[PDB]
Amino acid sequence: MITYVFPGQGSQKQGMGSGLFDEFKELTDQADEILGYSIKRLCLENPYSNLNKTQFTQPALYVVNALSYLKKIRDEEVKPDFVAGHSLGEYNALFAAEAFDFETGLQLVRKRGELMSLISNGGMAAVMGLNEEQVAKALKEYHLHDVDIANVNAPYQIVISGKKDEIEKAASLFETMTEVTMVLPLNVSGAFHSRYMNKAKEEFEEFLHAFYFSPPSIPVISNVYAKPYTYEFMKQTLADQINHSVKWTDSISYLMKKAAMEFEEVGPGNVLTGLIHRIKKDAEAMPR
Ligand SMILES: [Br-]
Ligand SMILES: [Br-]
Ligand SMILES: [Cl-]
Ligand SMILES: [Cl-]
């Protein structure tokens, strides 16, 4: 079996999508019409560092990941058995599973990036060396009560999120723990995937009711539940993703439990492939 995984924030890169925009001129056109600016020039020229501003990052990755997928299935004449994507990438999983049409997905990611671009006074940090339960127990033991787990990315790679002062305290606490080897601050100024996103999630949820969705043709493993999307809950699960943790390791472990599972990262970079490598190697280790 094969799963296609689609990357999110941090995998954008000037030069992303080179060749694809001219090869899919119909869809490139459709994206420029919606956005009001050239998606190709944003990606290949990165005017004014715009690729690293979320209101533009999210359309840019969604378009490059979508055209990457269309190129790959056309050249290989195969579709994947399952799809998933990390944060923003879940919109590209839903596009591959025909849950909405190309233009619809772009309007959703444009709105998502606008809402997230207005969030301030937050921070997120990637803690390396503790597993999910150890970070949850530490936030309790050490009274970091206003910090949330935002991503569970690899067996020992957890992202925490909260207001900026509380995240700097929590990062420094984690740096004193025995098994923590690095705490890296993420390039964001909002507490994404946390309780501080509750108002943005309510706004986005209401927004989704104007759009048109269809039952997936490929199962989409959701970030909120690490189980397939169902049609009647698709808008609630997509909105829920904004204020809940991304359960990436449980998503990939549910796919591996099926048996011989291949993963292919579709879009720029190799971030998800690196996470999957650590999830597979950890699954081969026994308890002690
Ligand atoms: Br091009
Ligand atoms: Br790891
Ligand atoms: Cl982003
Ligand atoms: Cl669902």
Curated annotation (Swiss-Prot):
Superkingdom to which the source organism belongs: Bacteria
Reactions mediated catalytically: holo-[ACP] + malonyl-CoA = malonyl-[ACP] + CoA
Keywords: Acyltransferase, Antibiotic biosynthesis, Cytoplasm, Transferase
Pathway(s) of this molecule: Antibiotic biosynthesis; bacillaene biosynthesis
Pfam families according to UniProt: Acyl_transf_1
Family: Belongs to the FabD family.
Listed name of the protein: Polyketide biosynthesis malonyl CoA-acyl carrier protein transacylase PksC
